[PDB]
Design a protein around this nucleic acid. Sequence first.
RNA 1: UGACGGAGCCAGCGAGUCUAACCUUGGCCGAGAGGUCUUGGUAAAAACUCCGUCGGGG
Lengths: 125, 104, 247, 85, 50, 102, 17, 36, 50
Amino acid sequence: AVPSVQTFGKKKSATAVAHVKAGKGLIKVNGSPITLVEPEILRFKVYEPLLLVGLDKFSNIDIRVRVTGGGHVSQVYAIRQAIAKGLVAYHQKYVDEQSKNELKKAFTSYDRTLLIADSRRPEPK
Amino acid sequence: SLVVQEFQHILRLLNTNVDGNIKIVYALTTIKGVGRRYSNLVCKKADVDLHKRAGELTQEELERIVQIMQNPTHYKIPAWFLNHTLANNVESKLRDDLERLKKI
Amino acid sequence: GLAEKALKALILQCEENPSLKNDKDIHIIINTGKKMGINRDNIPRIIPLTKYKLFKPRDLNILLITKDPSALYRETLTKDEHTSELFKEIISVKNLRRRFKGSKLTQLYKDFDLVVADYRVHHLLPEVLGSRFYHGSKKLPYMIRMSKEVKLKRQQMVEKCDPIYVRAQLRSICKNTSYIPNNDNCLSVRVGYIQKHSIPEILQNIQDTINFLTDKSKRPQGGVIKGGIISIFVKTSNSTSLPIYQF
Amino acid sequence: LDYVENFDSPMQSALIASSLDGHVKVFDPLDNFQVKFGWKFSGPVLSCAVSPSTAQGNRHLVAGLSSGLLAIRTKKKKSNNFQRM
Amino acid sequence: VKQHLQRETQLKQVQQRMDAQRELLKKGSKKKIVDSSGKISFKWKKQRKR
Amino acid sequence: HDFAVTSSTRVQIFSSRTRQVIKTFSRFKDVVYSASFRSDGKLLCAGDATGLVSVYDSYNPRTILLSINASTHPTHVTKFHTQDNKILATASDDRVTRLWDI
Amino acid sequence: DYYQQVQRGKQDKKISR
Amino acid sequence: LEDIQQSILKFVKDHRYPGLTPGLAPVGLSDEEDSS
Amino acid sequence: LREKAKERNPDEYYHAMHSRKTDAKGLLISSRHGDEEDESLSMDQVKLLK
RNA sequence: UGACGGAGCCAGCGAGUCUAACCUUGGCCGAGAGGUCUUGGUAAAAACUCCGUCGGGG
C-alpha cells in the first residue's frame, strides 16, 4: 500500500480537494506545479503554509490539489486551506503527534483560517 | 571650435495645417481623414525613419511624400486606404380616428 | 447580336431607374435541362477565367480568419513584405466570437468586402459569422489553404504558412469568379462589375464560364452541368430577365 | 573623456579621449600619459565611452559622431548502470 | 490470386506483431530499446534460461 | 550590460549582449542633452533643453518618476552623486549648478 | 425599347396562363 | 495482366475535411510570380 | 425524487457500500460488464487468450 | 477615475418531440393550390492579471 490522506478546503463557492501521500517532495495544483498560481499577487497567499512550517516537511511528501468553482480570490483561499489541513492530517496519521500539534500551533498562531473555515452566515438583529 | 548640422513650424497640406514636434505618422493622422496603417505604409514606402519629427525630413522627401499621398493610383495603393411630412400625417390621422372613437 | 443589344438595354435602363442606379453588379441566371445532384453547401467553387481579370486584392477589403493560436500567422503575414498591404484585418475565430455580436456583426457586414477563411474552420464559420453573411452569394466566405501541406492518417500535421502561396491564391480568387452547387436547374453566377470593363470582356467571360461549366473534364470542379443548357438570362440585382440562347 | 581602471588588460588604467577628427586616442597614466592606441572615425567624433570595470561580458567601446553616427566596437567572448560500473 | 497473396501477407505481419507481444510476457530481463527512426524493439539480457 | 545614448529628442538604451536598441525614451518635447544613469543602476536622469530634467527608472519608459523644473535656460549636464545616492547635481546655461535632493 | 418589350412579354405570359 | 503477373511473381485532399478538393483555388504561375 | 433528496438522512449505512462506488463528480458509476469479477484479467488468462 | 492590440485565467442558478422574423429580384415545374431554385436589404461570463502601442463633440 501507500500512505495517503484526503482533505477539503472552501471559500464561498470554491472547492479544493487535496491528496497528500508519501514521496519525493513535489506539489502540484490542478495539473500544474504550485509556482504557476494565476492571480499572481496571491501566490504568496498560497505559499503561506509552506514557508510557515518550512520546506523539509514538504520535501518528503507529494501533494496534489485540484480546485473548481468560485473565482480567483476564493480559489486561492480554498487552495491554501486544503494544503494546510492535508499537511497536519498527514502528520497526525503517518508521522507523530508532537509534530502534528506543533504544526497546529504554528498555523493557528499565524492564521486560524488555514484550518477551520469561517462561513459568513447572516445575523438578523 | 565649431560643429555644424546636415527647422520649420506647422506646415500646410491640402487645406489642413499640420504640426512639427510630433512623429510623421501622427502628423498624417492629423491630416484630415486618413488612417494610421495608411500613414505607416506611406512612410515606409518613402523609406524613411519612422521616429523622426516633422521638423526633419527635408523638402525633397517631403514633396515626394506629398506626391505619393496625392496620387495613390500611381503607387499601387490598395483600396482600403481611401476614405416630418409623414409625422404630421400620422399625427392628424391617428388623432382624428381616436377622436371619433372618443366621441362615440 | 441579341445578347449585345440586351446589355445595351440593361445598361441604359440601369442608368434610368434609381434603384437600378443603386445596385452595381451583373449576374447571369442559367437554366439547364436536368437537375444537379450536389446538395447546396456553402463552399464557393471558383471557375477559371482565361482572358480578363475581374478584381484585384489591391481593390478588395480583405478579412482573413485563421486558426486559434494565430500568432505566427498574423506576424508572418503582416511582416514578410508580400502580404503587409494585402489583408485589411487578420483575426482568429475565438477573437471573432469574443469580439463581435449583433449590431457589431452587421457593422462587419457593411464594413468588410471579402472574407477568406482557413479551410479547416470554414465548416465551423456560419454560426459565428451570423445569419446575414449567408444571404445569396455576394459575401460568401471562401477557403484558402494556409500552408501548402497535407495531412496523412495517424500522422501529426505540422503548422506553417507561406505568403507567396497565399498571395497567389488571393490573386487567382480575385482574377476569376465563382458559383455554388444546387438542386434545381436554375443556378446563378455573378459575372463582372458594371463599369470595371466593357461588353467584349463581359461576352468573353460568358463564353469562358459556359465552356468551363459544360466541360466534362475537371469534374470535381467543372463537370457539374447535367444535360444541355436550356437558356441563359442576364440581370442585375433589381432588373428583370433578359434572354440569350433559348435553345 | 573617459577613464577605466583595474580591468582585464595588460594596461592597468586606460584614460581615453575623443577629439572631433575621428581620432579616439587611449593613454595610460602609469607611463606619464603617453598614447598607446588610437582609432579613426571619419566624421567629427563627439562622445566616447569604454565599458566599465566590472563588465564580465563582451566589452564595448562606443563613439558617437556629429554626422549622426554611432560606432560600436566590441571585444567579444552515458547511462547510470555504465557510470556506476 | 493477387488478392490471396495480399491477404496472406497482411496475416503474416499481424502474426509477427502478435508473437512479439507474446514474447514480452514470459520471463527474463527485457530492455526496451528505441530505434532512432522512432520504432520500439526489445532486447533481452544475456542470461541462460533454465 | 546596458548603455544609454542621447540624440535629438531621443534617449536609447542599448544592450551589451546583442548590440541592439533595447529601449527608447522619447517623451521629450525638445532636444535632450544628457542621459546619465545613477551610480546604483536603477534610475536615470535626462536633462532637456527646455530647462527641465526628467529622472525616471531605466527599463520603464512609461513611468516618469520625477520631473525637476530647473532654470529656464537649457540644462546641459545632469549627474547623480557617486558616494551618496539621493542627491543629483545639474548645471545649465544659467551659469549656476544646483544640487537637488530628489 | 426592349426592356419594356420583355416586361410586356412576361406579363402577357402570366395573364395568358 | 503484365502488371498483375509482375505483382504475383514478385493532387490535394484532406482525410478529415472533405470540401478542400472542390474549394481550393487553381493556383497559377503568372499571378504567382508577376508584380501587378 | 427531490423530496427523497431532501429527506436523505446522511447516516444510512447499507452493506453494499463496499462494492458500489460513486463518481467524484457525483453520479453513480456502474460496471458495463454485469458481473462483479470481469473488471480486468490476470496474467495467466492473458497468456491463454493471446 | 483611460482608449487600442495580443496572451492568460475563474462561476452559479438553468433542460415540456419543445426555441422561434420580415418584405424583395427573377427562373423552372404545376390546370390550380402551391412546390422548388435564385437575388437584395431591413429586426434579437464580465470585471481581473500580464505584455506591447498611444498620448473638447455633428
